[PDB]
Amino acid sequence: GLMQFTLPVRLCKEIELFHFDIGPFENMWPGIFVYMVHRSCGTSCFELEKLCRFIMSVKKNYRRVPYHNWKHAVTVAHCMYAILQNNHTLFTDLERKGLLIACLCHDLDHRGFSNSYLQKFDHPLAALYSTSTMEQHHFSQTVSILQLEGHNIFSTLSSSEYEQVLEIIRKAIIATDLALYFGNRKQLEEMYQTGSLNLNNQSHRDRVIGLMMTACDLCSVTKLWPVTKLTANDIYAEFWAEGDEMKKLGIQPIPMMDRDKKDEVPQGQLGFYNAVAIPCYTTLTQILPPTEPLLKACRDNLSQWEKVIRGEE
Ligand SMILES: Cn1nc(N2CCCC2)nc1/C=C/c1nc2ccc(Cl)cn2n1
Ligand SMILES: [Mg+2]
Ligand SMILES: [Zn+2]
């Protein structure tokens, strides 16, 4: 009841910044997440005993893969926490509750392979879900864990508030399918420019939360240069493993996933920053002005990748 989570002074300050790194001590990540729910939502949002048991079952259902792991889950939740705290009054009590949960759960039971690799392998999940394959699996796993005894962190919600929050989480997690991001952002671009964008339109909110989710999901490109650089090693270890598996099925992988094309990595990051990250944080800054530091940080890291190509590191 009167039990605040507190963090050491350096974390208490740095956690409020977009570029915060949650550090290498796994055992502090849960407390960090609770800390963020309590400041983002209130100490009354979730029964503490239920929250802790939910967090530990979610942790247990993330796998020991190089990038799409429990660390990523909490990194993406922290970025969401930064967006919500810098835009206090634009979001409902239910959105604040659902979106941090959505981010923690968004890659549940990820195996470190793309939707493509599942479809080419002919994995059972590709038969059950034809599009956004892993993302429908992630939502399904979230619902599974919520239905474990003592795990229903939403128990105190009404029947219809429960349905609303599970629908926020579902759309949120589906949106992390980068194939859907491209059109979602084009539409948000047009609506903002023609002035038709209306945050009382529920389908407009949906799109805006969709963009926030892409922004949080990609936030490894908005960190201080050494964090960004080192996270890129974990990202390519998955990609190259997938390429190996593509070659095992008798298919040339895309260069991205070909470990014989290591040398081209800095140019590949450039493409990604230009085709994906910059446009994402640009459109987000237009819609939610206080998110500008994500744009600024992304631009800085782009400039560091140009520096790498130019042999200046
Ligand atoms: C398109 N392309 N092509 C390449 N390569 C061509 C040959 C060598 C590199 N690399 C990319 C994108 C990399 C990439 N993709 C993501 C996704 C999420 C996050 Cl957070 C960071 N990245 N970085
Ligand atoms: Mg994902
Ligand atoms: Zn993710």
Side-chain angles (χ1 to χ4, degrees), residues 86-225:
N86 284 274
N87 299 275
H88 178 49
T89 74
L90 277 78
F91 296 102
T92 60
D93 303 26
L94 275 181
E95 285 171 329
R96 273 192 266 86
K97 275 172 190 181
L99 284 172
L100 284 172
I101 296 300
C103 289
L104 197 68
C105 296
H106 84 282
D107 274 333
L108 261 171
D109 190 39
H110 203 288
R111 329 296 178 94
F113 302 110
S114 65
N115 285 339
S116 273
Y117 178 72
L118 284 220
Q119 297 155 25
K120 257 133 207 173
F121 183 86
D122 199 355
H123 189 282
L125 287 176
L128 180 47
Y129 317 120
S130 22
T131 69
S132 301
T133 303
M134 285 303 315
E135 290 85 12
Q136 300 203 66
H137 181 57
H138 304 318
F139 180 61
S140 176
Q141 293 279 285
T142 308
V143 164
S144 285
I145 278 155
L146 267 173
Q147 280 177 170
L148 265 22
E149 278 220 335
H151 282 59
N152 194 263
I153 59 168
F154 293 125
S155 50
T156 72
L157 269 44
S158 82
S159 190
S160 100
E161 282 192 298
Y162 185 96
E163 166 134 37
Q164 284 186 69
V165 89
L166 261 280
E167 194 67 340
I168 291 166
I169 290 157
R170 191 191 55 81
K171 290 179 212 147
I173 294 188
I174 300 308
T176 68
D177 178 3
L178 201 68
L180 300 181
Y181 144 74
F182 291 108
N184 179 55
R185 188 206 65 87
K186 272 155 209 153
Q187 285 267 227
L188 275 176
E189 196 64 344
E190 285 175 48
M191 290 176 187
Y192 165 84
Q193 278 176 25
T194 75
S196 34
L197 181 70
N198 171 25
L199 280 157
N200 289 315
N201 193 326
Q202 188 54 64
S203 51
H204 288 182
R205 291 188 88 68
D206 286 358
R207 296 207 166 269
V208 169
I209 293 155
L211 192 64
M212 287 165 56
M213 290 297 299
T214 312
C216 298
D217 199 24
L218 295 193
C219 75
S220 124
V221 306
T222 82
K223 298 300 181 206
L224 285 223
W225 166 245

Side-chain angles (χ1 to χ4, degrees), residues 63-69 107 109-115 117-118 134 138 234-235 237-243 245 257:
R63 292 175 176 236
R64 289 201 209 91
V65 292
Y67 174 68
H68 281 103
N69 52 44
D107 274 333
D109 190 39
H110 203 288
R111 329 296 178 94
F113 302 110
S114 65
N115 285 339
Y117 178 72
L118 284 220
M134 285 303 315
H138 304 318
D234 301 331
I235 296 162
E238 295 200 359
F239 284 165
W240 295 337
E242 182 168 321
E245 290 300 320
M257 295 180 176

